[PDB]
Amino acid sequence: GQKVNSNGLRFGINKNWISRWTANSHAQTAKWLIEDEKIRNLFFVNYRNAQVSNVEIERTQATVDVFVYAAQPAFLIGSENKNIQKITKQIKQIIGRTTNLDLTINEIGSPMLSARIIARDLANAIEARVPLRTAMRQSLIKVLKAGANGIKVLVSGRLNGAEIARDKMYIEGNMPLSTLRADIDYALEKAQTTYGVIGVKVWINRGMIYTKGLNRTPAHILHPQKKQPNRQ
RNA sequence: UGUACCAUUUUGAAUAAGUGACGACUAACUAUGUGCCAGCAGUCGCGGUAAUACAUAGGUCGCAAGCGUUAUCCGGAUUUAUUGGGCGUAAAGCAAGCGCAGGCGGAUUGAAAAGUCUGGUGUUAAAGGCAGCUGCUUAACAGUUGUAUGCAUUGGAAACUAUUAAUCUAGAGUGUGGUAGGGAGUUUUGGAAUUUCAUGUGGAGCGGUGAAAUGCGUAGAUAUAUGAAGGAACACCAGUGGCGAAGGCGAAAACUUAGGCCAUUACUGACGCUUAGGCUUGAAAGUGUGGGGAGCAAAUAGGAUUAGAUACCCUAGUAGUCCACACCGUAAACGAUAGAUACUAGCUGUCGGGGCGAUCCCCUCGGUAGUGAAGUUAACACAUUAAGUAUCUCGCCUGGGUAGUACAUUCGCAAGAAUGAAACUCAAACGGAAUUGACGGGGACCCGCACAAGUGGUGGAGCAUGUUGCUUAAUUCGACGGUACACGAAAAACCUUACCUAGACUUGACAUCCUUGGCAAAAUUAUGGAAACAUAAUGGAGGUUAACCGAGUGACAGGUGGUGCAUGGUUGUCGUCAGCUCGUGUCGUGAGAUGUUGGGUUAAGUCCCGCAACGAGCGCAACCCUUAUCGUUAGUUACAUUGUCUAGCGAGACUGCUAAUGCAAAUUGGAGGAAGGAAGGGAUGACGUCAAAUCAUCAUGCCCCUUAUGUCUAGGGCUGCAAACGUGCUACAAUGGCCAAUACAAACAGUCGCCAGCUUGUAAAAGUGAGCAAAUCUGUAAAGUUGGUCUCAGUUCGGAUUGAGGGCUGCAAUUCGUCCUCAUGAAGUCGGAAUCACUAGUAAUCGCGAAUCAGCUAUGUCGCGGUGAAUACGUUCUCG
RNA sequence: GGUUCCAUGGUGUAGUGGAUAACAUAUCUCCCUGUCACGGAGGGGUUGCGGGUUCGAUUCCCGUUGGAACCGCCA
RNA sequence: GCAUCUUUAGCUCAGUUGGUAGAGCAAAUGACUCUUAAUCAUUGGGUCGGGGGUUCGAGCCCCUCAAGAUGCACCA
RNA sequence: CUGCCGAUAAGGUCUUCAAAA
Ligand SMILES: *C(=O)[C@@H](N)CCCC[NH3+]
Ligand SMILES: [Mg+2]
Ligand SMILES: [Mg+2]
Ligand SMILES: [Mg+2]
Ligand SMILES: [Mg+2]
Ligand SMILES: [Mg+2]
Ligand SMILES: [Mg+2]
Ligand SMILES: [Mg+2]
Ligand SMILES: [Mg+2]
Ligand SMILES: [Mg+2]
Ligand SMILES: [Mg+2]
Ligand SMILES: [Mg+2]
Ligand SMILES: [Mg+2]
Ligand SMILES: [Mg+2]
Ligand SMILES: [Mg+2]
Ligand SMILES: [Mg+2]
Ligand SMILES: [Mg+2]
Ligand SMILES: [Mg+2]
Ligand SMILES: [Mg+2]
Ligand SMILES: [Mg+2]
Ligand SMILES: [Mg+2]
Ligand SMILES: [Mg+2]
Ligand SMILES: [Mg+2]
Ligand SMILES: [Mg+2]
Ligand SMILES: [Mg+2]
Ligand SMILES: [Mg+2]
Ligand SMILES: [Mg+2]
Ligand SMILES: [Mg+2]
Ligand SMILES: [Mg+2]
Ligand SMILES: [Mg+2]
Ligand SMILES: [Mg+2]
Ligand SMILES: [Mg+2]
Ligand SMILES: [Mg+2]
Ligand SMILES: [Mg+2]
Ligand SMILES: [Mg+2]
Ligand SMILES: [Mg+2]
Ligand SMILES: [Mg+2]
Ligand SMILES: [Mg+2]
Ligand SMILES: [Mg+2]
Ligand SMILES: [Mg+2]
Ligand SMILES: [Mg+2]
Ligand SMILES: [Mg+2]
Ligand SMILES: [Mg+2]
Ligand SMILES: [Mg+2]
Ligand SMILES: [Mg+2]
Ligand SMILES: [Mg+2]
Ligand SMILES: [Mg+2]
Ligand SMILES: [Mg+2]
Ligand SMILES: [Mg+2]
Ligand SMILES: [Mg+2]
Ligand SMILES: [Mg+2]
Ligand SMILES: [Mg+2]
Ligand SMILES: [Mg+2]
Ligand SMILES: [Mg+2]
Structure with missing residues (x-):
């Protein structure tokens, strides 16, 4: 038969949320919600040879923080920090120049x-x-x-x-x-x-x-x- | 015959490759087209819109100057089995017996030498066969030498068979002596019981069935008592039994008569086993003649049941069942196992003879049964009474249907019996055994609002909503038993919208990639406009192009277009039911079995015992949330009648203690406790089934459209209407209608909102207008209590429908919003066959809030509280 | 050629002595079942044509059609 | 012989007694299903046998032909 | 404790494979 999502059954009890933010209004709760999905999908769809395991998003009134865990971060880093600048511009176009980003790759064990x-x-x-x-x-x-x-x-x-x-x-x-x-x-x-x-x-x-x-x-x-x- | 052949003779790759197959047997695969159509096929079988099996193409494979197809013969085929098969359950043991000819056959001695073996000679024509060699360029081929098979004659061998001449008893018979039998025929005899009749008593039914009705009965039935007549069959004895070759044989007696078992110091001395043909017997039904006929009952009549009943049930009822004499010769005539002979563990019964002498029991020789190893078998199973190790003889079998049919023949009065094919058709068969499931109007056990016990409903009426059908330009698409139908849709006037009619557009409303610039898109005001869109205007944030605004530009964008039977994802269902499997091991030739089934205990495959099983995984349970008591922290925006209340942590309940009985899990009772034995509820839903649902949430293979199936806008449509069904609301009323006063909630929500108060208004509402970003302000609680009235009426019930006047939202309310006021007052007085939910704060009922939303007859959906029941004896029926 | 009978629902048949038309099957709707048949409830549908009498004709009277049943002989 | 009737889409038949034609099958198309059958809708399809005549008008009424079938004579 | 109790259109998927790690 049908089973409840294993991840979704354990959220809020033993598992934290991948995105932790509180929006201002019901209009700003939708923009801040689709945008983070784009960011996560970006990381997952392209840049796949890196083995990105999970990407977490942290936002305040205006400051966006990204915590990206990967198994091989050399491909994100690139040759003497090249590919890295590219991804920053990608992230800035999706959320907006008016905000502040603090992307953080964190190597995984x-x-x-x-x-x-x-x-x-x-x-x-x-x-x-x-x-x-x-x-x-x-x-x-x-x-x-x-x-x-x-x-x-x-x-x-x-x-x-x-x-x-x-x-x-x-x-x-x-x-x-x-x-x-x-x-x-x-x-x-x-x-x-x-x-x-x-x-x-x-x-x-x-x-x-x-x-x-x-x-x-x-x-x-x-x-x-x-x-x-x-x-x- | 200027032929084979030869040569440094000229020219020159010049003159020369096809066929079958590619899913498996069988070496060798992809695309296009078609779409159960066209076609292929030696067999299995491919083709129903993604075909490696068809058609074409490319590739590849098997062959080659040949390749395929067709025909015929042999092998493979142990598939007519001498070598070399079978007959219990798959084809096949005649129904059984008496048996001539035939086949086989105890031991010893002698002779002959027909079989049997061996030596010599003759012959078995040549070619071919096999071996060697030679010759053709080697081969094919030609020649060459070698190479058996049988028959006859002659000379020997004497083990076995056959012949002859004889001896012996152990095979088989005979006699004497013991002895058990429902063995058979013929003739007599007996008692119960049924029926009919005769005679009494008696007084209304009897009879029959699931329930009844034909039928019998006041003409005295059924019943009861006695008697008479007649026919058929022989209770108990009667069996984990006896006899006969089989069919069969069971009251008693007489006569005639058959076979068998045991012991034999007797006798004959192989006289024995089987048996084609032949003869005898042979259940029941059936036939012919003559008797008999009580009961029963084919055919037949009637009454039932039934959609129909020529059947199952009942009441009648002829032939027949019975006897004598003549036929018929078939049966699941079965131990589905032909007869005879010798050998091969054992145990338990039972019957007969013999030995001992109370039985009982012991031994011997036989008959009839059960269990059981080697052995056999495909398995079931057989197993000293073989289906085991072997021999002799007879009968029979050779795929299924045609078919035990047809023709011919023999027998029969007759029905029929015996014998017995073929043409044609299939790839298998109402084949055999066994295994896993499913199913059973098969059993055993256990569960659930299943039945039962109650309550309130539905099906009848009006209305709301969804569906079927019909119509229309469109009435967009999907869901279709349970598991669709207040479903997707948690909001169709425009928008939504996917549909129809129209007016407009084409790298496009949206996107990337590329050469190239940015010194804009918006919004709004004009004119034409149904609006799309055009022509003119302020030429616009900014940041020098960041994003976008563009030009040029072809790849392309786009599709709610098809296929949920190509899928991913998600979900319904069995079902919160208790199941589903794996590893190792063991058993079985094998599918497979074991564990997982037995006994107890649960809601549970929960646990404990037992156990060729030992363990493990998923599910179950607990860990999570919530409600019920208390402790601690905190005291405002709660409380402030002082400890409620709100939310963080913690304690508490653990079969923890006791009594009973069980090995142990565990069940029941009691104690204390707010809470007792899953304390109530929720989340949590195994492998899998139904090719279950969704391409219309999204994503996606493939197919289809590409100035149109894509795009923008205006109007219509999704709201129709002779009809039917599903889910709800409102009622048909005094447990009520209307009016007045009035008490008591929880949860949730709120700044384009909640809206207090005030003013106006018969009212929906309008204006003013504080308060509240919220335990603060706002969202009137209703049923309920009291008082007045109605007085049972189609009404002061019921509100439908209809007309008019108003209010709100919105460009816009006609198609098609709802609210208020006035006017009218359909049906309906408890709803047919049949159905649904529910086991306590539950059913029933009364309000309140939220989601999507500018507004919405949402009476829908998701939540919250107020009042608050009845019943459960039980599993016989019912569903799963 | 003549004489008697009949014409009732979609199919098989009753009635009416003038005032009135039923039965069965069939048909429709709804229970019923997985579905259907069977079953249950309810609903529906009728005098050959003409012409006279009567206030009134399916009925009474005379004609005209169609289908049947009887006869059509003596030479 | 005679009198009588019939000829109607691919087939079997009503037409109505004069304003020019349908019914039931067959075929096709869809819908419907994995696909069919079946079902369901829809639907094209006519020289009213050939000519003449009447009529304003003939499938319809009257004649002649062509092909069959009926009832009356293979002289009572 | 023996009422009654009938039927169900055709053809169809699904095992690809162990060479092995
Ligand atoms: C019999 O039937 C006769 N009367 C008939 C003779 C007819 C001759 N043409
Ligand atoms: Mg071919
Ligand atoms: Mg092919
Ligand atoms: Mg052969
Ligand atoms: Mg052979
Ligand atoms: Mg054999
Ligand atoms: Mg047999
Ligand atoms: Mg026998
Ligand atoms: Mg036999
Ligand atoms: Mg004998
Ligand atoms: Mg003999
Ligand atoms: Mg020779
Ligand atoms: Mg030669
Ligand atoms: Mg007597
Ligand atoms: Mg007999
Ligand atoms: Mg009868
Ligand atoms: Mg009787
Ligand atoms: Mg008889
Ligand atoms: Mg026989
Ligand atoms: Mg045995
Ligand atoms: Mg044959
Ligand atoms: Mg025979
Ligand atoms: Mg047969
Ligand atoms: Mg079985
Ligand atoms: Mg009940
Ligand atoms: Mg109703
Ligand atoms: Mg009704
Ligand atoms: Mg629809
Ligand atoms: Mg579908
Ligand atoms: Mg369903
Ligand atoms: Mg619209
Ligand atoms: Mg500028
Ligand atoms: Mg520039
Ligand atoms: Mg598409
Ligand atoms: Mg599916
Ligand atoms: Mg066991
Ligand atoms: Mg066990
Ligand atoms: Mg659980
Ligand atoms: Mg399907
Ligand atoms: Mg519109
Ligand atoms: Mg609707
Ligand atoms: Mg409701
Ligand atoms: Mg009152
Ligand atoms: Mg206050
Ligand atoms: Mg009334
Ligand atoms: Mg009312
Ligand atoms: Mg209106
Ligand atoms: Mg009343
Ligand atoms: Mg319950
Ligand atoms: Mg109610
Ligand atoms: Mg119904
Ligand atoms: Mg005469
Ligand atoms: Mg389809
Ligand atoms: Mg019945």
Whole structure:
């Protein structure tokens, strides 16, 4: 049957919001809401070879702050800070010159156990004509070796160019979806294949959060260092 | 025959490549076209608008001066099985027996030598066959030498078979001695019971069924008691049994008669097994002649049931069922297993003879059963009574339908029996066994407003809204049992809008990429205008082009156009039901089984035990939110009748204690407690099913349009109307209508808004106008209490419809907004067959608020509080 | 050629001694079921043509059509 | 022979008794479905057998032909 | 505790593949 979004079921209890701002009026609540979606989509659609895991947005009456986590930030940084200037101009055109931006790339730790880049890698493999069975298994084994709990991958679509759509799942371990205390990270991606669209869904279990609180604490960014800059 | 061949003879790549296939068997794939059409096919099968199977093209593969197709023969085919198959459940053991000819057949001795083996000789024509060699440029081919097979004759071998001459008893029979039987035929005899009749008593039904009705009965039935007549069959005994070759045999007796078991110091001395043809017997039905006929009952008549009933039920009812003599010769005639012979673990019964002598029990020899290993089988299963290891003999089988049909023949009075095909057609078969599911008008157990017990409704009337159908220029599109129909749509006058009629536009209303400049787009005022749009004006923020304003410019933009049966995403449903699987191991040739099923306990695959299973994952449960009590922090904009109230943290409830019984989980009761055994509610919805819903939220493969299916605007339309259905509102009333006074909420919302008060107005509202960015100000609570009146009427019920006058929003209210006032006063007096929801603050009912919104007969949707019930005995029926 | 009968709903048939027309099937709407048949409720639909009598004709009278049933013989 | 009737889209038949034609099938088109069947809507399709005559006007009334079928004589 | 209880148009998907990591 149908299931409630795993990310959406855990918001406001154990998971913080990706955008944290309070608008002035119901007219300014819509502009500030579509614009941040454009920024997030920009980061995700293009600049994909970087493995951007999550982009957070922080806005005040007039000051915009962006916290961008990536696995390989060299591509964003570019050759002696070139590509970086380009993206700043991109961000300024979307929000406006009248405001103040404080974009912040922040390098990420433990990149494997994140459902976003795994789905992106999965989608790239399917688009690259890689056999589906082999592609998921290599991603599954590497993620488990990274030192996490069970992972559930559902890859539904016109499998292998077939005319009848199927779906292949591969769970390997305890994925307690009905439990609220668990840390389940979820992401979904659309692999654009020449024979249509492939939907990949990745459920990852990253332990149990036994410390009550609406997070305010990082998630799989702590193990190695996490810095770099571009801020003020 | 100037032929093969030869040569440094001239010229010169010049004179020369096709066919089949490409989904699998079977080496070799893509596009275009078509769209269950045209076509392909040796087999499985491809084609229903994304075809590697069709057509064309490109590529590739298999062959080659050949390649495919067709025809015929052999192999593969162990698929007529001598080598080399089978007959319990798949085709196939005759219904059984007596059996001649045929086949086979105990042991020992002698002879012969017909089979059998071997030596010599003759022959089995030449070509061909196989081996070697030679010759053609090697080969194909030609020649060359070698190379068997059988028959006859002759000379030996004597193990086995056959023949002959004899001996023996162990095979098989005979006799004596024990002995068990529903074995058969013929002739007599007996008692219950039914029916009819005769005689009494008696007095209204009997009979029959799911329920009844034909029928019988005051002419005295049913019933009761006695008697007589007659026919058929032989309760109990009677069986985890007996006899016979089979069919079959069960009251008692007599006569005749068949076979069998056990022990044999007796006798014959292979006389034995099987059996084509032949003969005998052979359930029931049926036939012919003559008797008999109580009961029952094919055919038949009537009454029921039924859409129909020539059937199941009931009441009658002939042939027949019975006997004697003649036929018929078929059955699931079954142990679905032909007969005979020898061998191969065991255990438990039961019957008969014999040995012992109370039975009972022990042993021996046989008959009849159950369980069971090796062994066999495709599996089920058989297993000393074989379907096991083997031999002999007979019968029978060779895919399914045609078909046990047709012709011919034999038998029969007759129906028919025996024997028994083919033409044609299919790729399989009402094939066999077993496995996983589904289903059952099959069982066992357990659940849910399912039934049951109640309450209030719906189907009847008026109105609102959605749908079907019809119409129209359009009535845009989708949803269509449960799981569509107050659904998408949380707002159709314009806009929305996707539709129709018209007036206008073409790299376009919007976008990027490119050569190139920016010294604008807006908005608004004029004129023509239905408005789109044009011609003229202030020429405009800014920042030198940032963004945009453009020119030039072709790739293109654009599509609510098709396909939810190509999809991604999201959702309904079973269902918040308790399920769905995996790893390792074990069993099974295999699909598969195990765990996951057994016993207890739950809402639960929840847990505990048992257990060839041991564990694990998803679901279940808990962690999350909210309501119920209290502690702590805080005290304004709450409270201020002083500790409410509001929201942060925490305590509290954990089967924690006790009693009962259970191994243990756990169930029930009690204690204390605000709360007791998921304390109430919410979020949370496994694998999957229905090719379930959506291309019209969005995204997207493919197809289609490209001065039009794209774009702008005005008007119309989505609001129609002979009709039908669904969901709601209002009612049909005194538990009420109207009027007056009046008490008690929670939640939510608010600066183009909430709007207090005041003034005007019969009122919707207008003007003035504070207060409130909000625990402060505003959004009148109604049912309810009291008083007056109506007095049961189509009314002081009910409000539809209609006419007029007003108010608000908005350019604009006619198509098509709602509110108020006045006027009128349809139907309707509790609603047919049949249906829906609900297990406590629930049903019922009364108001209040919010979302989308300028406004909206939203009576809709999402929320909040006021009052506040009835019933649950139980699973027989009903749905899942 | 002559004589008797009949003409009623969409189909098969009753009635009316002048004042009045029903039955069954069929048809329609609604329960019913996954659906349909069957079942349940309710709804609907009629005198061959003509011409006279009567206040009034399906009925009574005379003619005209169509369909049937009887006869048409003696030489 | 005679008297009588009939000839009507592709087929089977009503037309009405004079103002010039439909019904039911078949075909097609859509709708409808995965696609069909079925269903449903819609729909094109006529020398009223050939000529003559009457009439202002003939599928309609009267004649002659062409092709069939009826009832009356293969002399009672 | 034996009422009654009938039917359901045709053809169709779906396993691509282990060479292996
Ligand atoms: C019999 O029928 C006769 N009267 C008829 C003779 C006819 C001759 N033309
Ligand atoms: Mg071909
Ligand atoms: Mg082809
Ligand atoms: Mg062969
Ligand atoms: Mg052979
Ligand atoms: Mg065989
Ligand atoms: Mg057989
Ligand atoms: Mg036998
Ligand atoms: Mg037999
Ligand atoms: Mg014998
Ligand atoms: Mg003999
Ligand atoms: Mg020779
Ligand atoms: Mg030769
Ligand atoms: Mg007697
Ligand atoms: Mg008999
Ligand atoms: Mg009868
Ligand atoms: Mg009887
Ligand atoms: Mg008889
Ligand atoms: Mg037989
Ligand atoms: Mg056995
Ligand atoms: Mg045959
Ligand atoms: Mg035979
Ligand atoms: Mg058959
Ligand atoms: Mg089965
Ligand atoms: Mg009830
Ligand atoms: Mg109603
Ligand atoms: Mg009605
Ligand atoms: Mg519609
Ligand atoms: Mg649809
Ligand atoms: Mg549905
Ligand atoms: Mg409009
Ligand atoms: Mg300027
Ligand atoms: Mg410039
Ligand atoms: Mg499109
Ligand atoms: Mg679907
Ligand atoms: Mg077990
Ligand atoms: Mg168990
Ligand atoms: Mg839960
Ligand atoms: Mg569908
Ligand atoms: Mg309009
Ligand atoms: Mg509407
Ligand atoms: Mg309602
Ligand atoms: Mg009162
Ligand atoms: Mg105050
Ligand atoms: Mg009335
Ligand atoms: Mg009223
Ligand atoms: Mg109006
Ligand atoms: Mg009343
Ligand atoms: Mg309940
Ligand atoms: Mg009510
Ligand atoms: Mg209904
Ligand atoms: Mg005479
Ligand atoms: Mg369709
Ligand atoms: Mg019944």
